[PDB]
Amino acid sequence: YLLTQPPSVSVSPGQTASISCSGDKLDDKYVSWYYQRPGQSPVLLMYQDFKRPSGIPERLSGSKSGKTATLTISGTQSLDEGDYYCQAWDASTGVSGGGTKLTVLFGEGTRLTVLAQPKAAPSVTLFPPSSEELQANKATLVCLISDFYPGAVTVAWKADSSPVKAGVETTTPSKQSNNKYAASSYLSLTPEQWKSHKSYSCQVTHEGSTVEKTVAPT
Amino acid sequence: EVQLVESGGEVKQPGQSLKISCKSSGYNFLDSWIGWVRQIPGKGLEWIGIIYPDDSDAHYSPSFEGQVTMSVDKSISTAYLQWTTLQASDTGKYFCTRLYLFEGAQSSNAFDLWGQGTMILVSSGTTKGPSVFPLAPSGTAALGCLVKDYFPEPVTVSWNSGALTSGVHTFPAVLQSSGLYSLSSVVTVPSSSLGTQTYICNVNHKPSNTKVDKKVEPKS
Amino acid sequence: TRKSIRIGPGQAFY
Numbered sequence: 001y002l003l004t005q006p007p008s009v010s011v012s013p014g015q016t017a018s019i020s021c022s023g024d025k026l027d028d029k030y031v032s033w034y035y036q037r038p039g040q041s042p043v044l045l046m047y048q049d050f051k052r053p054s055g056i057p058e059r060l061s062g063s064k065s066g067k068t069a070t071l072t073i074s075g076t077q078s079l080d081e082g083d084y085y086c087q088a089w090d091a092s093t094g095v096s097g098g099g100t101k102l103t104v105l106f107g108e109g110t111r112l113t114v115l116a117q118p119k120a121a122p123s124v125t126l127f128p129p130s131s132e133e134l135q136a137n138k139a140t141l142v143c144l145i146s147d148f149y150p151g152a153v154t155v156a157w158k159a160d161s162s163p164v165k166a167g168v169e170t171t172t173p174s175k176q177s178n179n180k181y182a183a184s185s186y187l188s189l190t191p192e193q194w195k196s197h198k199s200y201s202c203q204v205t206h207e208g209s210t211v212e213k214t215v216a217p218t
Numbered sequence: 219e220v221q222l223v224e225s226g227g228e229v230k231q232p233g234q235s236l237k238i239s240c241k242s243s244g245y246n247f248l249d250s251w252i253g254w255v256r257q258i259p260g261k262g263l264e265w266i267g268i269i270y271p272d273d274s275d276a277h278y279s280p281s282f283e284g285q286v287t288m289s290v291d292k293s294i295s296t297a298y299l300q301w302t303t304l305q306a307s308d309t310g311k312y313f314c315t316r317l318y319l320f321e322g323a324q325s326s327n328a329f330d331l332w333g334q335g336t337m338i339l340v341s342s343g344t345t346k347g348p349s350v351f352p353l354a355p356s357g358t359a360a361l362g363c364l365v366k367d368y369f370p371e372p373v374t375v376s377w378n379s380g381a382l383t384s385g386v387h388t389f390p391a392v393l394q395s396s397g398l399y400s401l402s403s404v405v406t407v408p409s410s411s412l413g414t415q416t417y418i419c420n421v422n423h424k425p426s427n428t429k430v431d432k433k434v435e436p437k438s
Numbered sequence: 439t440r441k442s443i444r445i446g447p448g449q450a451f452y
Binding site: 030032034036041042043044047048051053085087101102103104105106107108109125127130131132133136138140142144146167169170171172174176182183184186188218 | 253255260261262263264265268277279280313315320322324326327328329330332333334335349351352353354360362364366387389390391392393394395400401402404437
Binding site: 249250251270275317319324326327 | 447
């Protein structure tokens with residue numbers, strides 16, 4: 001089987017986040033929970049369904065009902081933001097025999113967002129191909145999305161009116177020295193494509209709302 | 219202390235072989251199983267296999283059996299995972315870990331100890347310095363530098379030699395489909411002080427020892 | 439003994 005987890009979870013500061021983990025065998029398999037900050041290494045949080053390893057605060061608690069196990073964190077804080085993974089095992093003697101096969105499965109994880117500031121709206125700065133790049137037979141559209149809280153965005157490009165999904169590369173969001181979020185998106189085209197279309201647009205969609213910017217050849 | 223220490227990050231080519239090291243210390247290296255988990259960053263964690271350093275009984279994840287090999291060398295208390303032949307999928311941050319026997323009342327197991335992770339980038343891109351394009355402007359304005367098609371990371375961008383540190387947002391870089399990178403760095407400045415102040419971005423990419431200076435001029 | 443791995447409640451290995 002496999003472990004399923006909410007790709008992301010939000011709790012307001014000082015409040016209780018619950019993070020679930022669903023597996024077809026977890027009705028009878030010890031779960032363990034891990035922490036990971038971007039760049040840093042995984043930390044054991046919880047093992048054997050509920051057992052806090054030493055040095056891990058009482059405010060974190062671990063339970064499992066049915067095929068569902070839950071990580072609970074009370075008293076949440078900025079210091080809790082990161083990913084959290086449930087793990088478990090699986091065995092199976094071979095029918096031909098040849099022993100017992102062990103497997104360690106991990107959930108895919110839950111980015112925990114702690115809502116430390118108010119919902120803010122993306123600043124979008126869209127740039128057109130420069131003379132230099134155009135003179136270099138390349139063309140690049142540069143969508144700068146900055147200052148959104150929280151930290152999710154679907155991005156989209158209109159080639160004139162229709163979406164275009166060729167030559168698109170976006171960055172998974174990143175915090176700032178202010179503490180909102182920031183990502184970039186790019187559309188590659190030929191100096192042809194650019195020249196001929198009436199316009200191109202960058203279409204950011206953040207928290208149930210959408211906002212687009214536009215450019216046309218000089 | 220109790221710690222696992224791992225080899226440094228490598229940039230390998232598809233089809234090159236590879237072998238990474240996890241040295242162990244603070245406990246009995248042979249009595250606790252060793253683990254190998256992958257971080258396809260932005261993506262999940264991906265377990266690879268376990269081995270018992272005493273006898274080398276292993277258990278490979280059914281996705282690496284055949285493409286990866288785990289070994290141990292006791293005299294230097296070091297655990298190894300190795301490829302005969304790499305491939306772009308084999309990319310990711312490889313963490314080795316230690317499986318702990320929690321001799322509780324009713325006993326259980328889990329990974330309390332972790333190496334810093336070895337980073338493996340599998341790609342054919344060449345080392346290559348970025349081309350550089352003004353992102354010209356049109357109460358505050360945004361100008362910035364397009365830093366295009368370089369491999370591998372990182373470039374470093376400062377502005378006006380290091381005079382301009384305020385308003386500067388240097389975005390993370392994408393990995394475009396070519397297997398190359400681009401990032402941008404925008405400054406936010408006053409409109410009025412545009413014909414006035416001069417704005418030059420500096421883009422160092424040590425891998426190819428490439429420094430570029432680019433004056434960002436308003437268009438018209 | 440130092441090699442065993444308990445998957446979960448009731449099932450024991452090595």
